[PDB]
């Protein structure tokens, strides 16, 4: 299994492409972008959210790729 900080909020899925929202939530880029196709909102607190507000988390993305190298 994988540590919680490498997984999407509430989910079992590994974030291969983590992004931070302005609120502080970190989640996979592929989830939040598909949510934004339907609604211009942060899905958790309902604030306005657009794609340009998302930030990469390079150190976490690298740490996750490093963890994937344990097979």
Curated annotation (Swiss-Prot):
Quote the PTM field.
Answer: Proteolytically cleaved by caspases during apoptosis.
- U-box domain location is 1-71
Superkingdom, taxonomy of origin = Eukaryota
Q: Which residues carry this modification: Phosphoserine?
A: 39
Tissue spec: Expressed in differentiated myotubes (at protein level). Highest expression in ovary, testis, heart and skeletal muscle. Expression is low in colon, thymus and peripheral blood leukocytes. Almost undetectable in lung and spleen.
Q: Which family does it belong to?
A: Belongs to the ubiquitin conjugation factor E4 family.
Entry function: Ubiquitin-protein ligase that probably functions as an E3 ligase in conjunction with specific E1 and E2 ligases. May also function as an E4 ligase mediating the assembly of polyubiquitin chains on substrates ubiquitinated by another E3 ubiquitin ligase. May regulate myosin assembly in striated muscles together with STUB1 and VCP/p97 by targeting myosin chaperone UNC45B for proteasomal degradation.
Q: What is known of its domains?
A: The U-box domain is required for the ubiquitin protein ligase activity.
Q: Whom does it interact with, and what assembly results?
A: Interacts with VCP/p97. Interacts with STUB1/CHIP and UNC45B.
Q: Quote the protein name from its UniProt record.
A: Ubiquitin conjugation factor E4 B
Q: Which gene encodes it?
A: UBE4B
Span covered, complete protein: 1227 to 1297 of 1302
């Amino acid at each position: 299994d994988a540590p919680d900080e490498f997984r999407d909020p509430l989910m079992d899925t590994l974030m291969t492409d983590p992004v931070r929202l302005p609120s502080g939530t970190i989640m996979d880029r592929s989830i939040i972008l598909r949510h934004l196709l339907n609604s211009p909102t942060d899905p958790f607190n309902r604030q306005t959210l657009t794609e340009s507000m998302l930030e990469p988390v390079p150190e976490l993305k690298e740490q996750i790729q490093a963890w994937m190298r344990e097979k």
